[PDB]
Amino acid sequence: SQQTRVLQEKLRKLKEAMLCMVCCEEEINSTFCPCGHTVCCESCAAQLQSCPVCRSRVEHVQHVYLPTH
Amino acid sequence: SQQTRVLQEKLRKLKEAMLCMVCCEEEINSTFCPCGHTVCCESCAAQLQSCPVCRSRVEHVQHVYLPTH
Ligand SMILES: C[C@H]1CNC[C@H](CO)C1
Ligand SMILES: [Zn+2]
Numbered sequence: 619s620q621q622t623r624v625l626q627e628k629l630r631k632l633k634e635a636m637l638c639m640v641c642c643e644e645e646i647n648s649t650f651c652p653c654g655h656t657v658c659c660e661s662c663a664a665q666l667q668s669c670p671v672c673r674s675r676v677e678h679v680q681h682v683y684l685p686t687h
Numbered sequence: 688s689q690q691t692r693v694l695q696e697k698l699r700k701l702k703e704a705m706l707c708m709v710c711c712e713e714e715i716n717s718t719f720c721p722c723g724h725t726v727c728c729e730s731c732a733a734q735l736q737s738c739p740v741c742r743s744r745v746e747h748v749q750h751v752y753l754p755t756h
């Protein structure tokens with residue numbers, strides 16, 4: 619039904635929000651510290667000096683294990 | 688249709704996976720460091736001395752800003 623299409627769209631958008639903002643291919647699994655922005659996969663987070671969201675210096679990257687992984 | 692019920696179940700389970708594993712009421716927004724398990728809201732995370740997934744000591748809690756928030 620049209621309701622099935624609405625639910626498909628909601629699911630698709632939630633799933634896309636869990637993907638890396640740089641490569642758009644891998645799941646987010648890394649946090650920039652200390653700002654806390656958690657928006658990249660490990661590979662894309664590895665060489666950034668500053669956060670791509672807030673420009674704060676990245677002191678280190680914390681790996682995150684999320685139940686949605 | 689029956690597919691509407693299946694999609695509602697998939698959406699409900701994905702949303703439940705983003706809720707705190709301890710209180711079941713608030714969104715996950717906190718990481719236990721250094722283990723990386725990201726399974727609690729800020730209120731339950733503040734009250735735990737050991738990670739509820741792996742039992743490692745919590746040195747500190749990092750707030751995470753996720754695009755799914
Ligand atoms: C964003 C809320 C999540 N946990 C409850 C808190 C009450 O101030 C804040
Ligand atoms: Zn990436």
Ligand SMILES: [Zn+2]
Pocket residue numbers: 650653654655669670671672673674
């Ligand atoms: Zn940031």
Ligand SMILES: [Zn+2]
Pocket residue numbers: 707708709710711712713727728729730731732
């Ligand atoms: Zn909680």
Ligand SMILES: [Zn+2]
Pocket residue numbers: 719722723724738739740741742743
């Ligand atoms: Zn842990």
